[PDB]
């Protein structure tokens, strides 16, 4: 009866039941192997970490079956063959992957009904909008997907390899400058918690650094799991600043404030006006306090002065892509739109292309 929603995140798989306010199972997407513990078990244990969804596209299919089996049995604690599971895919997904996903779901778990939706259109609908470019900055990639009345333009979808993983790596690199040596995978979780709890995007990086070099009120204090109290100074705004100045990591690609402008300028000229005033942000990486103001300032610096830029950022943009799918699967009139196993048996794996 109840429908499952397994969001295939690049660094966090969000799973739960349709109708809830937030996903129930949230665990990192890693498949540990010694020199096969999947998900949360790999962090506790000598293993080589592998990501099958590293860059938004499933390149290692062999581990995706184990990921989904774990998510269904040890995380959701429900049988997959008795509950329909809705799935989300990253934009610019090839047809072969879209067919393989539903083929695996229908042949391994034998779930009675499934559905594949796009993360961009779901995140856009979750903000009460149907036309507007969405900024999907996840853990592995950062996508800029301009959508028109619920139809994303695949030719203007920009993909950026800068995401929360590189931010965590840069934070690990800059924390050793003070003396805090976090090198192992266990301390990586502490660095991620520090980034989530103490980092923020500054309105003006150069001006903020000037005050941080002199004032002492900006220095915060974090409590390590072992009881030690480490202090972080100007690293609160330097870590999320990479999203706008990727020279910190070393990639030549422009920041998330310029790729958006480059993608908007690639669509139709008559729909550019509805894209500048409908910029929606999503993903866990856009949860920094003060990122919307910086994005608006940078776009207004880039965009023409005549037209106005409105940047809306919902407070639930971290799990908006999962909440959208949950609400779509919890509809009392959606039970007839699923892809039942009979239609699959008739039409092969290509049914998902016609239905979706």
């Amino acid at each position: 009866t109840t429908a499952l929603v397994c969001d295939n995140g690049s660094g966090l798989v969000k799973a739960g039941f349709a109708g809830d306010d937030a996903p129930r199972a949230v665990f990192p997407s890693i498949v540990g192997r010694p020199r096969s513990y999947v998900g949360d078990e790999a962090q506790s244990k000598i293993l080589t970490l592998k990501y099958p969804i590293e860059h938004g596209i499933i390149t290692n299919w062999d581990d995706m079956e184990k990921i989904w089996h774990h998510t269904f049995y040890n995380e959701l604690r429900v049988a997959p063959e008795e509950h329909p599971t809705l799935l989300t895919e990253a934009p610019l997904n090839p047809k072969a992957n879209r067919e393989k996903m539903t083929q695996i779901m229908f042949e391994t778990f034998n779930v009675p009904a499934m559905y594949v939706a796009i993360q961009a259109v779901l995140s856009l609908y979750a903000s009460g909008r149907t036309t507007g470019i969405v900024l999907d900055s996840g853990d592995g990639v950062t996508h800029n997907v301009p959508i028109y009345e619920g139809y994303a333009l695949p030719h203007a979808i920009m993909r950026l390899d800068l995401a929360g993983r590189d931010l965590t790596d840069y934070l690990m690199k800059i924390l050793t400058e003070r003396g805090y040596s976090f090198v192992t995978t266990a301390e990586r979780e502490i660095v991620r918690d520090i980034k989530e709890k103490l980092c923020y995007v500054a309105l003006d990086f150069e001006n903020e650094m000037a005050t941080a070099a002199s004032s002492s009120s900006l220095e915060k204090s974090y409590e390590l799991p072992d009881g030690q109290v480490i202090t972080i100074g100007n690293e609160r705004f330097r870590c999320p600043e990479t999203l706008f100045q990727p020279s910190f990591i070393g990639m030549e690609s422009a920041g998330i404030h310029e790729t958006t402008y480059n993608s908007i300028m690639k669509c139709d000229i008559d729909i550019r006006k509805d894209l500048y005033a409908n910029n929606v942000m999503s993903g866990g990486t856009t949860m920094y306090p003060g990122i919307a103001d910086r994005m608006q300032k940078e776009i207004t610096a880039l965009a023409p002065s005549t037209m106005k830029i409105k940047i809306i950022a919902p407070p639930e943009r971290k799990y908006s892509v999962w909440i959208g799918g949950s609400i779509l699967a919890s509809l009392s009139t959606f039970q007839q739109m699923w892809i039942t196993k009979q239609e699959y048996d008739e039409a092969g794996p290509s049914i998902v292309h016609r239905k979706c």
Binding site: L124, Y125, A126, S127, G128, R129, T130, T131, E149, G150, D274, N278, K310, I312, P314, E316, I323, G324, I327, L328, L331, S332, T333, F334, M337
Partner: protein, 164 residues
């Protein structure tokens, strides 16, 4: 998607879009601007008889058809709309209908996702409509200039019988 349209909304749209020769006493109860809602079960698009605007009253009790229409939209929920505009261009005088998609940020996500994913289920059944107006903030829909900007841009000199 999901939610479909009922027969009453389709009948109202066919009644408003295509007008015929009518008596002067009956012509005053035509539908000027009607909103659309969801039932208890959230499975059909139904118009609410409570909030509405007649053609007869326009220019009488309702001094401004658009001004009295902004406050009619609830700010705590998502709503559809269908406004029959009578704007004057430099080039000529036109009379078109406008589809207003009202979706404030203060509404819960359950009412936003349902109304955003089922927009193609209602807009496809409304054949012949051209002017689409998507409004999320209240200040942007409250302003009078935005309607002339969406309808004809800078060409619209007067909106609803009065200049801009």
């Amino acid at each position: 998607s999901g939610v479909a349209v009922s027969d009453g909304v389709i009948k109202v749209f066919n009644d408003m879009k295509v007008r015929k020769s009518s008596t002067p006493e009956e012509v005053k109860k035509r539908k000027k601007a009607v909103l659309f809602c969801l039932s208890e079960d959230k499975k059909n698009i139904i118009l609410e008889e409570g909030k509405e605007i007649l053609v007869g009253d326009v220019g009488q009790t309702v001094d401004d058809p658009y001004a009295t229409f902004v406050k009619m939209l609830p700010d705590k929920d998502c709503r559809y709309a269908l406004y029959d505009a009578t704007y004057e261009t430099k080039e000529s005088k036109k009379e078109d209908l406008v589809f207003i998609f009202w979706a404030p940020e203060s509404a819960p996500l359950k009412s936003k996702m349902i109304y955003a994913s089922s927009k193609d289920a209602i807009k496809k059944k409304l054949t012949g409509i051209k002017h689409e107006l998507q409004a999320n903030c209240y200040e942007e829909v409250k302003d009078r200039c935005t309607l002339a900007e969406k309808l004809g841009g800078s060409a619209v000199i007067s909106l609803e019988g009065k200049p801009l």
